[PDB]
């Protein structure tokens, strides 16, 4: 069943783990002038569920320069009271000989004509380590997945 | 008290931007602890400490936030007892007792793994009735029986039984057969899995045969390892 | 019960216990309580395809014998398996026909455990009687025997 912290929320994604033994439901609200995201993390073997945050994020596999194994990154973007920030991070223990990936943050810019605007979708190219971000207005930005350095931003919609 | 391993280096300073973690596990009166020492070998203060585990075979999690309240100054070294329980999400790891960890502070997130010694998962109520022991050993498929060798042991059966008792491995019965001591023993994991054991102690033989029956025989290898460590320490 | 493979023989090794021989294993079943058939060992390949014909154990049920014969090149060749249950090790036939006895040798207080086995081989048919495992403490060992059949 849908956990009440979600009630009235824009459902925007549904995700499981590989075993389907955990389930994630997400949705966002326009709560008091910000895009607040709600998540439901359901345990299927425990039969217990909890509430959590947010909105445009995806996971990659990236081989860092001198390692043999592909670090599992979790890249997510939000606009908060501090303004819009993208985070890339390792998730879980590095495969054994791997030198850990430094966590990253960068700010995502929203113009003054971008008055409300916030993140909405993310996709990463594995072919070219790049983070594609789409906002609510129809703005795009690409960031370098390893070093979150901005590489372009423009309106396409 | 049961066997506790010496602390070992889990995260070296040079891998973790000057953070050094050493650790062991303990069981104190029905309570599991991850016992660590954190040392700041960096030139910055360290703050904002936090920890999590990946999903694991015995559903092991911290039961509270990590109790580091004050900045860990350069050169400083603190002893941290983190309480654990087994209520957390289960995913079967390889090895079965491996635990993946992430530790954060104000500089970065770091990761490491360590191996949980299974005797901290041996529960207080792990003594089987003799009746039930015989019935359960007989109910468990004989293909599940696994044999192991405790090499170079010279403890008497009494001393084996008292040391194992202190680790919640209970002796149910003892059989003298022609100078051989047979010890029949039960233990129970935090997940409710029972393990039954026959130790065989023979005159002249520096090696004891440990025979283990379990419904989940994959675990038996790890019981033997800590059984061996308890006898040898 | 309902075994998951047909059992290609059985014999009541004791006052309460049922040996089941499947195509690839042997199982004891007790009669007693809710307990179900227990695998004591798998079938050793020298038996494969054989007319099984007997199964036998020792009084201790600490050795198990499976037997069974073939019509190999015009002869009724008997195979046997001799499983050790405490050792967990199993030989093809070193004694095919064989049984164990307790015997009190003339000036001893204690009954020596004899293992009698009879084979035909390249040297022809030989029965062997032997002591099995250490004599009881004051006992004069039994001399190993061999005779041709």
The helix-and-strand class of chain A reads: mainly beta
The helix-and-strand class of chain B reads: mainly beta
Say how many strands of chain B there are.
Answer: 13
Number of H/I helices of chain A: 0
**Largest sheet, strands/sense/barrel of chain B:** 5 strands, antiparallel
Outline type of chain A:
flat
CATH architectural type of the largest domain in chain B: Sandwich
Subcellular location (chain A): Cytoplasmic vesicle membrane; Membrane, Coated pit
Protein name (chain A): Clathrin heavy chain
Function (chain A): Clathrin is the major protein of the polyhedral coat of coated pits and vesicles.
Organism (chain A): Sus scrofa (Pig)
Can you summarize this structure?
Chain A is an all-beta fold and 157 residues long. Chain A has no helices and 12 strands. Chain A folds into 2 domains: 10-52; 56-155.
Topology:
The complex is a heterotrimer, with two copies of chain A and one copy of chain B (233 residues).
Chain A: E1 10-16, E2 22-28, E3 37-43, E4 49-52, E5 56-63, E6 70-78, E7 85-90, E8 104-107, E9 119-125, E10 130-135, E11 139-144, E12 150-155
Antiparallel strand pairs in A: 1-2, 2-3, 3-4, 5-6, 6-7, 7-8, 9-10, 10-11, 11-12
Chain B: E1 8-11, E2 19-28, E3 31-40, E4 50-53, E5 61-62, E6 77-85, E7 98-104, E8 109-115, H1 130-139, E9 146-150, H2 157-165, E10 170-177, E11 180-188, E12 194-201, E13 208-214, H3 220-232
Antiparallel strand pairs in B: 1-2, 2-3, 3-6, 4-7, 5-6, 7-8, 9-13, 10-11, 11-12, 12-13
PDB class: endocytosis
Keywords: Clathrin, clathrin adaptor
Assembly: trimeric
């Amino acid at each position: 069943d849908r956990h009440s912290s979600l009630a009235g929320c824009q459902i925007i994604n549904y995700r499981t783990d590989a075993k389907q033994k955990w389930l994630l439901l997400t949705g966002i609200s326009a709560q008091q002038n910000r895009v607040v995201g709600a998540m439901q993390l359901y345990s299927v073997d425990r039969k217990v569920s909890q509430p959590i945050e947010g909105h445009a994020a995806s996971f990659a596999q990236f081989k860092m320069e001198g390692n043999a194994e592909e670090s599992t990154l979790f890249c997510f973007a939000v606009r908060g009271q501090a303004g819009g920030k993208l985070h890339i991070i390792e998730v879980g223990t590095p495969p054994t000989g791997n030198q850990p990936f430094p966590k990253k943050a960068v700010d995502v810019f929203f113009p003054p004509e971008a008055q409300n605007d916030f993140p909405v979708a993310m996709q990463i190219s594995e072919k070219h380590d790049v983070v594609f971000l789409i906002t609510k207005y129809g703005y795009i930005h690409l960031y370098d997945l390893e070093t979150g350095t901005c590489i372009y931003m423009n309106r396409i919609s | 008290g049961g066997y506790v391993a010496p602390k070992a280096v889990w995260l070296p300073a040079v891998k973790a931007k000057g953070l050094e973690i050493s650790g062991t596990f303990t069981h104190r009166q029905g309570h599991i602890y991850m016992e660590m020492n954190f040392t700041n070998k960096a030139l910055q203060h360290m703050t904002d400490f936090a920890i999590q585990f990946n999903k694991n075979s015995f559903g092991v999690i911290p039961s509270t936030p990590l109790a580091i309240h004050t900045p860990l100054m350069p050169n400083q070294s603190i002893d941290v007892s983190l309480p654990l329980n087994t209520l957390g999400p289960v995913m079967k790891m390889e090895p079965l007792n491996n635990l993946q960890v992430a530790v954060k502070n104000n500089i970065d997130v770091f990761y490491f793994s360590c191996l949980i010694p299974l005797n901290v998962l041996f529960v207080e109520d792990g003594k089987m009735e003799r009746q039930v022991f015989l019935a359960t050993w007989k109910d468990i498929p004989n293909e599940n029986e696994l044999q192991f060798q405790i090499k170079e042991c010279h403890l008497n059966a009494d001393t084996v039984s008292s040391k194992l008792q202190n680790n919640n491995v209970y002796t149910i019965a003892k059989r003298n057969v022609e100078g051989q001591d047979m010890l029949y023993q039960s233990l129970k994991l935090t997940n409710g899995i029972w393990i039954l054991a026959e130790l065989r102690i023979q005159p002249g033989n520096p090696n004891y045969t440990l025979s283990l029956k379990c419904r989940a025989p994959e675990v038996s290898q790890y019981i033997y390892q800590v059984y061996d460590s308890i006898l040898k320490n």
